[PDB]
């Protein structure tokens, strides 16, 4: 119902993320190419494949790595609307073009348009919510999340508490990256990736670092039991 | 019915574990003192509070540590019979001891110790611990034991090891000694290495490498002549 949810073209300008992840917008958003050899775009009918150049580059960079490891094709979910803003339906952030949802399934064969248009969600989390379905969990999903968490531009990765629990178990020695993995409601089929504010973006609000430690103990366990600049775009009918 | 189960007094002589944990006996077994300020003894009526001097010293060393951290009282379960021999299947060489995964802060009474109330810590589906019954002291209790240089293996339900794997953090090498096994939903089975001078004692190989929190832990969620002589 908002102008943000109605515009179909990005606001032309210098790429600028404005506000915070959960209250803001983005001017000069870039558009993720639809055709790629390393990834595919889901639910393009929602028109949520826009974002900051940094988000686009991270996707291209992450998808190229997965491909070169022969793990499959990346499936890209919600990014941001043409000018950012709150989603009518879906996660609550993604407002500044720095958040991207990625399916926790790596097809080894490209999906068809119909499949991408209406994805068949693969519920990983157990029926009670404390573990992952062992017959669906693949080593590639572990790798996918670890690779993402290792990018210097990524600050946080939100997944269901059960998924992080399966990660805590498989991490072994190399586990500082686990700190970037944060538990949250749902996120049973997608991992939510959030990037740091772009260096040159002056009206972007960053988040403190996450708690210290892998976070695999008590905190995880607790789970098992408008910016003037944006408003201006409205006040002047630019959206 | 076997002789082992009738004998009431340990065979006098120098302490000697004979055979292996699941098939052997022990000469010169020591008795865990009933009265202690750090631990109490469950089910004394079974007369299973006997074992090698090393086991008794381990229980005292551990109980003392737990007490000095103000964590509570250690409750000692099955150890070994007066002379060892064939609950669990091992415990035959006085080198195994079952410890209740519960640390009361107020000493139990005789009746409680005689009719223990097993505190099932594992969830109904068996894949995790009852969050409301799992305390931080239970974690510390298993860690302290695993860190003992004389301990080689500690058997617990898979779900309990799973919990330990989550709480461990960076200091986790000891997890290698924790081993998954059926049951053990209320007891942690502590096994000691063979005593140096018990030449007829047979040790086990070292446990697989790594913390074992991976593929292995997950797969679970889906008569020695000298002994035949004591029997006369
Ligand atoms: Zn999201
Ligand atoms: Zn469960
Ligand atoms: Zn036992």
From Swiss-Prot, chain B:
Gene3D superfamilies the UniProt entry points to: 3.30.1380.10
Keywords: Disulfide bond, Hydrolase, Metal-binding, Metalloprotease, Periplasm, Protease, Signal, Zinc
Residues reported to bind Zn(2+) 1: 88, 91, 98, 189
Residues that bind Zn(2+) 2: 125, 128
Intrachain disulfide bonds: 25-227, 165-213, 194-201
Record keyword rRNA processing present: no
Listed NCBIfam families: PRK09429.1 (NF006947)
Protein's name according to its UniProt entry: Penicillin-insensitive murein endopeptidase
High-level lineage: Bacteria, Pseudomonadati, Pseudomonadota, Gammaproteobacteria, Enterobacterales
